Every structure is written in C-alpha cells, then in structure tokens.
Design a binder for this molecule. Structure first.
Ligand SMILES: [Au+3]
Ligand SMILES: [Au+3]
Ligand SMILES: [Au+3]
Ligand SMILES: [Au+3]
Ligand SMILES: [Au+3]
Ligand SMILES: [Au+3]
Ligand SMILES: [Au+3]
Ligand SMILES: [Au+3]
Length: 129
C-alpha cells in the first residue's frame, strides 16, 4: 500500500506511535517518507545479506525472521513478511521495540541523516488529527 502523508500520520497515531518514547508524530512520518516513500511493500537488501522491510525498513539482522539472514535474531517475533502488510500494526509494534532499545530513532539511519533536528512538524502540517 502506498500511504498518503496525512493518511499515514493518522494510522501511526491510532496505533500509539505519536510521542512514543518522546518522538513526535512528525518524526515517524519523516522516517517513513525517507525509509520507504510511504510504501508498505518496500524491501532493500543490505551488503551483509540482511534485508529491510516495510514502511520503516525494519532489518532482519535483529528484528524479524526471513530465513535468509544467518546468525540473525527475530526480536519482534514475526516473519519479516508481516512488515509488508497494508495494515501497519506489525511495523508499529516492532518499531516501538526498536526505539526502546537504547539509541532511540538513531536506529534508523535515514532518520538521523534526513529528519533529526529538522522541522519535522511540517510532515503533519495540515493533517486532520
Ligand atoms: Au511533529
Ligand atoms: Au520491495
Ligand atoms: Au535477507
Ligand atoms: Au532475522
Ligand atoms: Au524461515
Ligand atoms: Au534467518
Ligand atoms: Au517466522
Ligand atoms: Au531518545
């Protein structure tokens, strides 16, 4: 599914991600925009053989099982395919675990390099929330 910007903000909010771990909803929307362009079916293979899945490009090295990432963990206890669903529940639930792991949203490289310290509220501007 390709979400609209306000549509994704509303979904993220319904699933409890707004101000989760202190991160305003604009931060989450900005991360999704640059991780996946709001496309739930986004995948990207890493040099190390792991893969990133979904709207927040969650990585199989730690967080999901895809059966093809040797020595990896599955800390969200889900198949990576579940992160590709039109319903973002699995991705939100896993993202909550990820952002609680210690380094906050810096776990998302694209967040650190393209969202952090910017005017992230712009990503929710004009949305009915
Ligand atoms: Au905001
Ligand atoms: Au893909
Ligand atoms: Au893989
Ligand atoms: Au894994
Ligand atoms: Au398997
Ligand atoms: Au594996
Ligand atoms: Au599985
Ligand atoms: Au923090």
């Amino acid at each position: 599914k390709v979400f609209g910007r306000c549509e994704l903000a509303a979904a993220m909010k319904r699933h409890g991600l707004d101000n989760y771990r202190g991160y305003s909803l604009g931060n989450w929307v900005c991360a999704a925009k640059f991780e996946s362009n709001f496309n739930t079916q986004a995948t990207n293979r890493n040099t190390d053989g792991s893969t990133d899945y979904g709207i927040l490009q969650i990585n199989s090295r730690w967080w999901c099982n895809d059966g093809r990432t040797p020595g990896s963990r599955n800390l969200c206890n889900i198949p990576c395919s579940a992160l590709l669903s039109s319903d973002i529940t699995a991705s939100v639930n896993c993202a909550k675990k990820i952002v609680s792991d210690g380094n906050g949203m810096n776990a998302w490289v694209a967040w650190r390099n393209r969202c952090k310290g910017t005017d992230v509220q712009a990503w929710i501007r004009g949305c009915r929330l």
